[PDB]
Structure formats: C-alpha cells, structure tokens
Amino acid sequence: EYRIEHDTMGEVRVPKDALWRAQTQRAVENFPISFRGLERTQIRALGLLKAACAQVNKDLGLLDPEKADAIIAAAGEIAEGKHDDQFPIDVFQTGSGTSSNMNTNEVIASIAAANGVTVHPNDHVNMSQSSNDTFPTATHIAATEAAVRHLIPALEVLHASLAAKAKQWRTVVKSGRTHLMDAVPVTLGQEFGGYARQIEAGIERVKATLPRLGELAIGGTAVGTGLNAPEGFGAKVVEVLVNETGLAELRTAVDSFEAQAARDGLVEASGALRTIAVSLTKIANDIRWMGSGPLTGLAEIQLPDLQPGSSIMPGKVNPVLPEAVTQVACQVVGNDAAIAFGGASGAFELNVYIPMMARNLLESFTLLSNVSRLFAERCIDGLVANEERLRELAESSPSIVTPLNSAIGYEEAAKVAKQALAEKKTIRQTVIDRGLIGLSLEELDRRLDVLAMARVK
Amino acid sequence: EYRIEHDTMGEVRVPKDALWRAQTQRAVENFPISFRGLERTQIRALGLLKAACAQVNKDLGLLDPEKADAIIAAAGEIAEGKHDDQFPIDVFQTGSGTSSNMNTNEVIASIAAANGVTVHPNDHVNMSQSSNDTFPTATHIAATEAAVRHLIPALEVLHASLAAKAKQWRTVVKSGRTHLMDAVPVTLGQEFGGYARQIEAGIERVKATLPRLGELAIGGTAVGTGLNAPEGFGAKVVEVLVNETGLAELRTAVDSFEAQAARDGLVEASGALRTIAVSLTKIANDIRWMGSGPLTGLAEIQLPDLQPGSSIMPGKVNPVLPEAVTQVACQVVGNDAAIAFGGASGAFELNVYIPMMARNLLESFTLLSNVSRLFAERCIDGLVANEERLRELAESSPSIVTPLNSAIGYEEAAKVAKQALAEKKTIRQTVIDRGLIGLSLEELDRRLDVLAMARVK
C-alpha cells in the first residue's frame, strides 16, 4: 500500500507507513545493488549532525524555534536508533551521500509532521547545509567516535592481556626461532612483550591519525565556499557536536576545499588499521603455532578450548580465535585497498566515493574492536604455558654454542655445532671432546645456562 | 527463554525456539565480530549439499531411508530459504566453516525431530563428510551458480546495451581524445564498441575461470584422503548436484589435496571480477565525462535523469549510476585483495580462510551482477547524443592536420597546427595561407572530411 509524494523531478509512490519520502524512494529504486544500508553509527551521526545544525540555525535567528525544536527532537529519535528501518538506501548510492542526506531530512520532516509541525526537508531540515559537507561530516564523526570510543579501548584490553603474559612468563625460557630454525634462547614473556608493544604501537598509530580524521567539512556547503551558510556556521556546529558527544577530537577543517574535494583523512585512518592488521596476523600466527599439536606440532602453550574442533575427527580442538583474527586482518587489508582506490578518484570540488569509503573504514574499526577484545579475553587470558617442555626446547638447540664465539671464534664454534648434531650429543660434550677446554670447564657451563642466555630484564 | 543441549565439550543454553543446537550456540558466543552471517546463496548451497549427500548415503545402503528422507526434506526447506534466521553464525568464524557446517547439521536434526524422526547431526546428517570438504564445496557451488546464473547474464544485458549504442552511433562523428588532449576523429559508436568489447572480454574472463571454479572438494573428507567416505562418494554427490541444479560446470576436484589445502580457484575467479571492475571504471568514467556540464564540461551526451542532484543546488542532476558503478569497482578491488591474502595463508592440509574468501567473492559477484544491469537499463539505454555539438568538436581539433603528413611531412604539418591556433583560424586556411597547395585544393578537402577521417566500418 502506497501514498504519493513529490520532489522537483515529479511524483513518486512511497509506502504508506514509511517515514521517508520521494527522494529516498527514488534512491531505493535507483540503487538495489548490495541491499545493505547505512550502519547504526552512521545513522546516529546524521541524527546528531541535523540536531546540531538546527540548534545553530535557531541560535542565529534563521530558523523558527518551533520548527528547530521539532527538528532537534526528531533528529534525536534518529540518533537514538528509533528509526533505523526508515533508512533503506543502499551503500552504493550517489557518491556524495545526497540520498542518505535527503533520507535523514525526509524522515525528520515526517516525524515532525506527526508532532503537529510542518518542516520542509530542504528549506528547514537542510537549512545552511549541503550533502557535500554534511555527509563527510557524519562520516568523520562516526570514524572518530569508532577510533576513540571503541577501537582504542579494545586495543587497550588486548595490550593489558598481552603485557600480563609478558610479566607472567618473564622467566619461562624457551628456544628462540629465526627463519623457523633453532635459535638462541628467549622467554615466552619476551615474545609476548613484543606482541604487547605491537599493540601499543597500534594505539599510537590510530591516535596519530586523529588530528586529521577529526576534521569536519561542516560549513563548506556545496563546494567549500560556505555559500548559503552564515558566517562561522561550521565552528558553531562543531562546538555543539563537541558539547553533545564529548569528542574533543572533532574540529573544523584546516582547508575547506581539501575537506570536500578529498577524503584523505579516511585513507590515513585506514592505513593505521591496516598496520594493526599486519601486527595482529603475526601475533595470532605465532600463538596458533605455539598451540599446535598436541603431538605433531610445537606444543609450547595450550589455548583455551572454545568449541568442538571437527564434525568428523572426534576430540580435536582448533585455534578458532586466531583464525577469526587472521581472517579479520584480511578483511581490513581488502577494505583498505577499496578505501584508497576511492580516495584517489576525486574530481574538482568533490570526492564522490564517500559512502563506499565510509562503509569500509567503519567496518574495519568494528571488526578490529570486536575481535581484539574476544582475542584478549577468550584466548590470551587463558593461555597456559608448557614450562618443562619449553626448558627442554631451549636446552636442545644447537645454537647454544653461540656465546662461545668470543672465546673460540665463529669458525671453530660451527665445527662444534655440526659435530654435535651428527653424534646426537650435547654442545658441552662436543666442545670438551673437541679439546677446547684449557676457555675453562667452569666458563663453558656459565655461558651454556639457557635462562642466563635469554638476558631477562 | 532457553533449553539445554550438549555436544562433546559439554552443556550449552540455546534459545527454546531456535532450531540450532549446542555447537551453533557456542559459535554465536565465540564470534560476535561483524554480526553478519552467511548469505542466502551460501545457506542454499549447504542445503542442496546436505540433501545430495543424504541421497548418496541412501543409495549406498549406509543411511536408513526414513532418516535420509527426513534429512533430504529438511535440507530442502533450508535450500528454499525457510530457515535463514536459523543461521546466526558470524562470517568471521573458524576458518574451515566447521561452525556453519554444524549449524546446518543441527538445524536439519531439529526439523526432522519435529517430523517424528531422530537423526544425529554428526552420525547421520554429516555421514561420510567433513566441514573440510563440504564447506568449500558449498562455497564453490555458490560461486559457480553466481557466475553462470547471475553475473554472465547481467554482463550480457550490459554488452547488448553497449553494442546497441555502438550500432546507433556508427556515424556520429566526434573528436577523439588522447592524454585528454584534442586528437583525430572517432565516432561515438566506435567508443561504445570498445566498451562493449571490454564487457564481452569480461564474459570470456569469467568463463575461463569456470573449469577450476567449478571443482568441488566433496569426497576428500578431513584431509583429502576420503577416509570415512565410501568409494566414489564425491563423484556420486557431484552427479546428484549436477542433476538438481543444472550446473554442468560443477565437477570433482582434479587433485583432492589441492582442493582443500588451497582455495586457488576463488582467487582465480576474483581476478576475473577485478578485471571487470577495471573495465567498468573506464566505461563509467568516460560516460560521466561525456555527460559533464551542461555548460562547464564536455556536454557530449545526456544521461537519463534518475533523481534530484543536490539538496542545496536546485535543478542540478548528477551521473549517479556511473558513481554506483565506480564505487562498486572499488569494492571489488578491495574484496579481491582480501581474497588473495586469505588464499596465500593456507597451511598443510587445509586453508582456513574459507568464510572470509567466500563472503568477499560472493559479494563481488552480487555487486557486479546488480550494478551491471542497472547501468545498462537506467543509464546506457537512455543515453542521448548531442550530434551537432559533437560534429563541431570534431571539426575544431587542430589534429585534423594529421592526414596531410604523407604529403607535407610531420615537421611542416606541425608548423600548420601551431600557426592555426595562434591565429584562431582553420587548418584549411593555415595550409592555403602557408602556400602548400600546388597537394591540391581538392585533395586538402577530401583529407579534411572528419567522418571520412574516422574510417567507419
């Protein structure tokens, strides 16, 4: 069942109970491509943004208080998520986000109409605005909130979890591995201290993007000039947004043309997430390798069991969380390539890849925030080390000859390693058999202590 | 409200009215990452696959007909899409798809239980199977159906639409452009014939991947050896699948270890789609450029109006379909990088990136199928050429001097072009003024006819 609405292009049938109107409905028919629309956090940002602009228009005497207040209230319902099903437009819409901007304007208009107030989607709800500043503004608010409120806290949990293991396993000695081959000793704690640093550096990486990710185009209107917006509109809206969200990271664009002609801050932000994905692949890979076996692998640690491993092989349990982490990392990398391709494809006063860039960036924030916390809590926290096996692994490496270098030289040392392996004997035995002692017996032992070799801080 | 179920790891609370059971529910708790589960076409493939395996197990006397028939019927309900909301597991699950495989087994078990029949998710519904052959099998069935039944037909519509314009605009002469600068004449029809060829070559590209995309692991069970599956199980299941789906492209794997240790056919298939995305970016870019203006751009053609252009600038209309196409192309490129990263990350007997690879590949098929048809029908078909403007564009290029090369030589020709531009005069005038005629007057004209210059077939 339908009603008639119109826009400047003509009449359109709209579902009778839909709060959207003509232009939203055209976009429904124009872009049935993915059948996925804006995310919760994007719809929220649009709501907050519309509320903020209405407030400033009210403050400056440009918009009737009754209309402003109903727009602010309607926008608030949208921001709170009462109307997400009134946002049916595909991600793959016109690249400025015009359609979703109008979708927000029209839904506000219909909510306000239901509360006794007549507001025009363009003339009132979109007063002093364009899609060309509002859609990227909403995108950067969403991205900034995602970075500050979701990803960074999630990474901090993961960091804490890894650092707790770095401390716990401080003196848990094991064989280092380089090139996958037997190396000199390290501690399990040292390795986890490395993983913790990768995550801490990741936090630094996301933070370093915030000064430019938090820039908002708001106020630049159609092409960056601010035509049809009053003086200092952008700064005024940003102040309301900072006041309402608590996100001090939000700010006016340094250059209002760069802020609309490009989405360079989104490409920058994705680069930090892609680096985090690179770090997480290494961390997760190492952990599932340490967990491998129980009998045909490394069996250095035990990961917590999360579910039955195999529909066919009874009793098997698999490192499912590292698998989720590594698959997420692939998605972030894919998403990152999509973001950059769109970023490079701007023209003159507007980059028209915003919805695709937003979808991909926001998804990477989400996947990384959610999988980092799960990895920390359902995997890292419950890892159990096989301490005795690990100490044997350390004492078995041939490369425990390495600290004898300064006393016998690299070349004689290598002769000890090749002879010890062909005999199935120890490094201590091959050197004492080689007649090298005389380098004392007491000195050979001190240098061959594996935990001393790891050089624990 | 909940009930108790168990698996080999213990007891799990499951929603009372959920048709899934213990293992699905663990996966719900283990992988809340993206909150997007399997697509319609993946759930379908799993249903068909389970029906087919049950039939073969019935045929070989290994599975009680009453149990087989209830599994076949239950699987059929799943295949038809009656139970998509009983598949809540995240894409970012264990990388073999164990969880979704078990999700299918458990939902079938609960449907059959409701019809008076007791079938064990492992012992019966998963008889002769592993996730390690079934999940990639379902993925390759979905991908192959997507290629054959959706993308290729969509591309054929787009091809027809472009070729119709190649014919329509056969003698519509215009200035060619190289490096974005004035070149010798072409016809609008020639350009569209190029775009049509890119799409035809795209069809060829997808087709060329089908011999390996259509390979199915079915029968290789846990590691590729076929343990716990009867002799020729895979060939038998493939026959049922070919019979039921009509997809002759489906086939047994050439090597049953390669078919599980890798997903190389998915990377191959994505390469063809990425090439199509590269082609579509060029086609769409050209079309929006030809459509640019109306007064400050090229204004060669007019694209059909699809919606009001701008919330702020009245009357403006934008090339929204080319924007959808180019954004889709970015997504396909991103998806393609994700697919390849997962593809490269296999280990020993199993690549455990299947759900992420499947999600990305299937999405690229979908986005490309849907946007290609929209582009054909809502853009290409209604394009209107500005024939008189185009003929003036052709006759204005300085490079119409080019066919005089053989008569006056490259160097004197260049002297004609530089003098004609500094005077604001024609090529004919600059050559006759330059005293070159005597090369006759009649010959200069014949060579300067622009439509003859385009060399129409």
Add this chain to the structure above:
Amino acid sequence: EYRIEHDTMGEVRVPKDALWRAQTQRAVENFPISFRGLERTQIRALGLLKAACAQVNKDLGLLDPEKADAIIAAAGEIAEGKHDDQFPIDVFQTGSGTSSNMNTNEVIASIAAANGVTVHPNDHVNMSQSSNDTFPTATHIAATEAAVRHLIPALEVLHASLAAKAKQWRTVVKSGRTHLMDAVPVTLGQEFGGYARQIEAGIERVKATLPRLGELAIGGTAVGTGLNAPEGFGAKVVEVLVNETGLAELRTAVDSFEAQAARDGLVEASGALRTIAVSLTKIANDIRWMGSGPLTGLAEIQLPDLQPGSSIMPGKVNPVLPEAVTQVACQVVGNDAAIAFGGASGAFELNVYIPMMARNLLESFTLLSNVSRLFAERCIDGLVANEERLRELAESSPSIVTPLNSAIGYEEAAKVAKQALAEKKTIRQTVIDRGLIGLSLEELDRRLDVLAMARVK
C-alpha cells in the same frame, strides 16, 4: 661534450656520441624519477616491431627499399641488444610511451645515418604508426614472449620436480595437519601432488590469458581508426611478427578501440601471476615448515644446504629458497595492485599508464620464471624425507580414532580421544580399556593401520 639537434619544439643539446636525438634528450631531462629505463625484452620488442613495420611499408610500396632496409638492419641491431645503453628514458615517462617510441625511431635514424642512409625518425622510421598502437604492441609482444618462452617452461620444471616427489614419496606416511592441529594420516607424496597440481593449474591459468594477452593494437594508429596507416597494415605486421618470433599467440586486436583505450589484457595476465604467487606462498611455507628445526620444529624433511645460515649463530642453515619465493610472491602481489590501478585509469581513446603497467607485469613474469626454476632445482629436487620420524608422527595423532566413527559413533569416539591424551596412552589401549571391543580386536587393528588410513592410489 654535446651536439645540437632539433624537433618541432626547438633545439636541444644531445651528447656527441649518443645515437638518440632531440626528443629522447628532452625525456631524459623531463623524467629523472626512478633512473631505470626499459628492460632488455622491451627494447627487443620495439626493435622487432620497427623492423616488421618497415618491411610492410616496403612491401606496400610506401617506403623506399634503401631506407626500409637500413631501418630493418638498424632495428635488428636494437633487437639483438647492441644498443641498450642508447635507451636512457625513465619508465616514468609520458604514459603512452611516446618518448621510448621516439627513442627507438631516433636511434634507428642515427645508426642508418652511419651506414650512409638518411631516414627521418617520424616520416620514415615511424611511417604508418603512432606510439599509441606501437608501444602497447611492443608491451604485449614482450608479455606474450615472457609467458610462452620463459614462465611456462620454468613452471613446467617446477611441476616436474614436485610431481617427481609426489611419486617418490607415494607411501611415505605422516600425520596430516588441519588448523595446525593433529589430523588423520596422509602421505608426503599426496601433499606434493597437491603442490604439483597448484603449479599445473598455474600453467593453465597463464595459458587461459594468452588469447587476449597476445592481442596487438598495431594498425590502430593514433586513436584506433587506423588513419595514416594503409588497409590491413596491422594484419600484415602481425604476420611478419609471427613469422619472425614463432609466437603464434600474437594476433590483431578484436576491437581496435578497446586495444588502445585500455590495457585490460595486462590486468588479466597479472591476475594469473598473482594466483601463481598465492600458490607459491602456500607451497614454500609448507616446505620451510616441514624443514623447521632441527630440534625445536617439525623436522619432517631436510632441505639442501645453500649457504651458511647466520653471521652470528655458527652451524645454523636457513630455508633461503623458500624465503626468496615468498618475497617474490609479495612483489608480484604489489606489482599486480599497481597494474590494476593504472588499468582502471584510462580516458577516452588512450590509457596512459602503459610504461608503468609494462614494467610491473614484465617484472612479475621474470621474478616468477627465475625463482620457480631455482626453487625446483636448488630446493625441491634435493629434499630428503625423514621417513621413520614421519611414521611415528602418523601413529601418534589422537585423530587415528576417526575411522572407528561408524562402529562406535562420533560421541564415544571423542571420549576415547580425550581419555587417551590425559593418560599418555594409545588409541588402541583406550578403546580396549573402555570395553568397546565385542567392533572386534582384529577390526580395531585394521582400521588403525596408518598407511591404509592414507588411502594411497
């Protein structure tokens, strides 16, 4: 020391002994970016191409035989590699390859001048041509020769080497691994048969691209119309090229506009190489993992020693060839993303990313051809299996309980696996202790034979 030359833009100083002239020298000054110029195979292709065009121009009476013959001879010296140091222009030149085309024309002119014959770089050496058909033509000849004469033979060596191991290790039983965890048995030969299939499929993949990679633009001249080229020039040049090179894969473009407006065949070809890189990462990773240790890893095989492992740790030797292979695979993936970005960026009658696309594609052919042969000969051929260790690995996996499923059911089977691991006892012992026999004693043994479990063909 310098001489004066000119072109249509004016006078340029050129080194006195340089065979290039004005336009090459401008490009030297215009593009000092990478300081790497065209590859041997590109210079060759340009030489052959110029010889072929001169021959056809001779055949058709359009070019004086004395001038044609000196151009053919000069071009032949270039093709043979006598003048590579006369090609100093950067890869990062004008995107049509104009500069390298002119570089070839000018060097031919100067060689011919030294043999008593005066040929104009444009009017004679470039007769019936543009850079816009010749540079992509030379690029596709180079790419096709690389595929047919270098990569495919190299892959065939690698395929043979892997298949020889598949045969050699047919009955060398070992534990399969899925998710990195203990699985049911396979043979080392089965795994290598998988790797061999990945390489055979790679061969198929490159072959499948040849019908479109081998398309040549030759004849389309400036914009694809063939202006200033005689009728059937392209077909005539292609015939000479096929006659001279033996490459039957070379052919005229299906559509002469698509063949210049895009380089879609180069993106297609790169997709096949990227798939090969994905396959090689898996193969190489597995091999270095099987080689890992000697004491802290898997120690399944021994790779041939190629050089001392470590400047610091005496005696260590590392899998350096797998490292070369995996790093090459990264480069191919990078190169592939560069190729596609350029491919998508065409405009109207010409894609002007050709030199960058050519550089990247040709490098991927080279790296893959060279590393595949080295990997085959210096690694794969000399691999030695640790047969006794491998048979113990197979017999230790808990998942050897799997073939008891049909007799005792998945759930009781899992109870056997969990009890056997907590006891440090065998599967046979845990089932006989569990009172399951009575499933006979003779049947338990037959099902527990590990080589029978691998299901060798």
Add this chain to the structure above:
Amino acid sequence: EYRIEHDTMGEVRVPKDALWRAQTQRAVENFPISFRGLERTQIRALGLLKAACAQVNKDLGLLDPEKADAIIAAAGEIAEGKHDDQFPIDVFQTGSGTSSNMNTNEVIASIAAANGVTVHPNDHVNMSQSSNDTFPTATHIAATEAAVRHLIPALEVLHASLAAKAKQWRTVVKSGRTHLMDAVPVTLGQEFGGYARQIEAGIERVKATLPRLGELAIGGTAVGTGLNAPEGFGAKVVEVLVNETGLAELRTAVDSFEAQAARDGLVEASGALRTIAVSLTKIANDIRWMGSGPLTGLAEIQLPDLQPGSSIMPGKVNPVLPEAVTQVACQVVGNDAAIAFGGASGAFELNVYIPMMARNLLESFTLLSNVSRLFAERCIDGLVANEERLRELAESSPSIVTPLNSAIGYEEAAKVAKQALAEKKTIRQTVIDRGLIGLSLEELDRRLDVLAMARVK
C-alpha cells in the same frame, strides 16, 4: 679468472678482482632472480653502521684499534660509494639480509687486507652483531634519511609551488564542479589551496611516522636478547649514528623483540606514502583536466610545454608531468601492498621479508621525492590561467540560482534552473520573467555576482 675462498660450508670460486668473498659468491649463485641489488642508500647505511659498531667495539676495548680503524676506514669507503659494484647480491635473497650483511663484512675485510690489516668478516667486522639487528637497522636508517632529507624537502617545494598559485589566483573566479557537473563558483586559487593543504597534510603524515620509523634494532643481536653484544651497545651505536648523520630521529627500539620480529614501522611509513599517492592522483588529475583541450576539453589553464606530444599528430602537446605523477602513484600503491604482505608474514623472533620491504619502501620515497620536485618546477610553477574564459564559465553555470534559496525556496529555485536551460537564457532573466521580483531587482544582482559568490578570504 678466479681465486678460492672458504666459509664454514666449504670452498667457493670468487672472481680474482672481486672484494667480496665466499658467502657473497654463494648468494650470487643462489639468488639470480631480479638481477637488481641493494640501492646506493642501503649500501651507505650498511657502511655507516659498520663504522659505528667498530667504533663502539673500539671504545669498549673489545676490538683492536688497528683492526677497528681499518674497518672504520673501509666502511667509510663503502659509505661514500667507492664500492657499490662489490655488492652484487639480489634483492631477493635470504629474508634476514644475512647475505648483504656478510657482503659488507667481506668487502671490508678485503679492503683492510689491501691496507695491511687482517680482519675476520665474522669475528671482527661483525663483532657484537647479527644480520637480524644490523640489516633492519640499516633499512630504517635509509628510510629515515629518505623521509627527512629527501621526501619532506621535495614536498615542501611542491607545497610552496601550490601555495604560490593559491595566492596568485585568489580572485580568479571560475565554476566549481561537483559530480563533474556545473556547481556554484570557486576561485582557481581556492582549489590550489586545497591541493597545497593535501601536500602539507602529507608532510604531517610522514612526520607522524618518524617516531617509530626511526627505531633501530641495533643491539638486539640474534633474537632481540642482545647475546654476544655488550651492555648498552645499541644505545652507544645509535649515539655514534646520530652524531655522524645528524639524524636525531634515529633511536633505540622501544621493545627489542618487536623491532626484529616485525617491520611494522616500514608498513606504517608506507601508509603515509600511499596517502600522499592518493593526494597526488587527485592533484595531477585535476591539473591535466584543467589543461585539457585546447578545443575539445575544459581549457581552464595552460601547462608548460615539455616535449612534442605525438609521433603521429603534429603540434599536439600532452600533460606529461601529470602522467608521470599518476604512474608514480600507482607504483607507490603497488609497493605498499607488497610491503604489507611481507610485514604480516613474520614468524617468532624474525620477520624474514626485510630486503623486499626495504626495496619497495625506499623506491616509494625516491619516486615521490623526485616526481614531486619535477611536478612543482616543470609544471605547477609555469601554469598560466585563462582568466576571461574562467569568468565566463562561472557566469554560465545554472547553479548560480542557489543563493536565491532563502528568498524563493528550493522548489521555486529549481523551476528557475530548468526554465533557464530550456530557453538558453540567463538566471537573472528567468527569475524576472518568472515574476519573482517584488526579492528586489537590486538584491537579485548582488546575490548573482560570481566572485562575491566564491566568498574569497
């Protein structure tokens, strides 16, 4: 002609006059893959690094002053580039850089031998070191010097050039374009101010990576523990390096395991360069579009002529510098994907993709530094604007109706735009004809002034 050398693996023939020795020569035979070796800046870094380590070993009494001083002198010759042809090892070597590390040690040994001093490549030249800390150290020194001394200054020139045009063209009014369609007015200067900001933000982006790019592994030796290196060796070497190079950005690693197990700082650094490539594609694209024509394009500006455009079309000149910039941007994007793939592929105590990551990152620094300066000086500086054409473009856009919105409302405004285009009349005429005046005659004019519309600061 050859001599015999040996290493711990045995005897190797080495060219008689080569300064390298056994291990370098094995690497020559082991890795003939790309036939491109280390860059000038990498060889330099290795030289400086070896000099610095020798100095510290001297300072601590661990290395004989005569041997140290000859190593410092030899290393200095290498650093200065006297011996680049003594570094023949392929980029695609063992992924730790062992071979190039040994190549440096052996060349120093042979130089010192020629000066009367016998130093052992391992025992002396490599004293207190591993490849595992030295090769990444040299890589990060090279990358940091490239960022600080080459790229940032090059970007500052480009920034100055763009900002000079932003100032010059402050009041040069033109039509804005969004979606490629006619928009409201901007100034050419505003657009260039946007491009300048993208470059300034790029500078910020590279700077933001320096705190982690400048971290050096030096001191962590084999696995990060510092075994066989004295206490505070790393800090001591870093101090010498900072003293010698002036690069205060160089620093000790925050965590010595993260600094060898990963190359996350290289992926981070590449992300900043990839963002710069995205920005440069937009800037260059816009500029070649503004330059397009002269008769069939936008013809907004004139780029400086750099070389004859076309071998075939006389007189044509093409935007060759924007083409070089956009092709470089593709290469940086490709390189960036290669870097990240290698970065993600670390294992335990060592990421063994260093040479490939270094090659790609250093090339991106180089291409971007060189093309940015060329673009600034040979393109941007000499751009000439077509001021009268531009003012007509501004006054022709239909969207000059936009500032009437607040007076007549969006819907009536759109009626003015559609009627003005169908009539071929002006906005002023269509509104006065529409009877809207009465909104006064004087007010319509003030709002329709195009330079006032651009809102110049």
